[PDB]
Amino acid sequence: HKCDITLQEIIKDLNSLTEQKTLCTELTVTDIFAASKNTTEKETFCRAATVLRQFYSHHEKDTRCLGATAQQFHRHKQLIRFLKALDRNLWGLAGLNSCPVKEANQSTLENFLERLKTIMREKYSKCSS
């Protein structure tokens, strides 16, 4: 369960997400990593899955993000697609729907995805030889 290949799928989604910039990636999420580390692994995933769901829900049809050019619109849809795929995997890992996220600090979506990627790669590393 813990060292399941879902970890690789999350890492994969994150790899695409962070190699991708859009009009929208500087917009903010609640910084669940500004906490003092007071949560189980399942709580962490639930928290991350929560803030990302707020983000894609709010920005999928947001005029600042939707794009003027074909390429901008494409990148916007890609981003929302990948966020939903990552979110889906996170919820499957979490095993939890209800986790309050209490941080004030906002970070750009971009910085948040890079942090989550570092934590995911650390989980993968702790799983293998």
Author numbering: 1 to 129
Report text from the authors:
Interleukin 4 (IL-4) is a pleiotropic cytokine that plays a major regulatory role in the immune system. Signal transduction of IL-4 is mediated by a sequential binding process, initiated first by binding of IL-4 to its high-affinity single membrane spanning receptor chain IL-4Rα. This intermediate ligand receptor complex then recruits one of two possible low-affinity receptor subunits, the common gamma chain (γc) or the IL-13Rα1 chain, into the functional hetero-trimeric complex to initiate signalling. The overall structure of IL-4 comprises the known four-helical bundle in up-up-down-down topology, which like the crystal packing is unaffected by these mutations.
We tested the interaction model proposed above by mutating Arg85 of IL-4 and the super-agonistic variants to alanine and measuring the residual binding affinity to IL-4Rα. If Arg85 is really involved in generating the additional stability/interaction, then, owing to cooperativity, mutation of this residue would have a greater effect in the super-agonistic variants (decrease in binding affinity) compared to wild-type IL-4. In contrast, the affinity of the IL-4 variant T13D-R85A is decreased 6.5-fold and its dissociation rate reflects IL-4 wild-type-like binding kinetics. Since the hallmark of the super-agonistic variants was a clearly decreased dissociation rate constant (relative koff (T13D or F82D) = 0.3 – 0.4 koff (IL-4wt)), this confirms the above mechanism by which Arg85 is involved in generating the higher binding affinity. To exclude the possibility that structural changes in addition to the removal of the Arg85 side chain play a role in the changes in binding stability, we determined the structures of the IL-4 variants R85A, T13D-R85A and F82D-R85A. No changes in the local structure around residues Thr/Asp13, Phe/Asp82 or Arg85 could be observed (data not shown).
